Amino acid sequence: GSSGSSGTLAQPVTIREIAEPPKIRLPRHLRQTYIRKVGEQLNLVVPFQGKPRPQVVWTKGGAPLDTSRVHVRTSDFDTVFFVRQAARSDSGEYELSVQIENMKDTATIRIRVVEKAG
């Protein structure tokens, strides 16, 4: 008779697979113009998920942090951002992207600095 079926011949593809995809868990306190005062110390904890070890990239508009005066303590678990004094200048947008074997993620953060009142 005549049966029906699909299929083709072609060597398989062997390639390592990812354990867990990158995910930038943004808190509710970051989903809004971060209002802060000048001089005060900044503290931002943006947790990230993924495996085996998701990289953490920090950029301000497109360029990486000067990493000269800023103290960025990234932990396998989550990353942490802090600053001695929040100068009105700092006020901008912090983009956080997670690098992975064959995956990548991005995120935006709004930061606003206001001069103390007197």
Q: Phi/psi at 103 (nearest 5 deg)? A: -135, 160
Cα 37 to Cα 7, 41, 118: the distances in Å are 65, 9, 12
Q: Spell out the domain ranges in the chain.
A: 19-118
Please compute Rg for the chain using Cα positions.
21
Q: How far apart are CA 108 and CA 97, in angstroms?
A: 9
The experimental technique used to determine this model is: NMR
Q: How far apart are CA 72 and CA 43, in angstroms?
A: 10
Residue 6 tokens read as 């699909």
Could you please report the per-residue DSSP string of 9-58?
A: ----------SEEEEE---TTTSS-EEEESSSPEEEEEEEEEES--EEEE
Q: How far apart are CA 81 and CA 74, in angstroms?
A: 8
Q: Phi/psi at 4 (nearest 5 deg)? A: -120, 140
> 19-118 adopts what CATH topology?
Immunoglobulin-like (2.60.40)
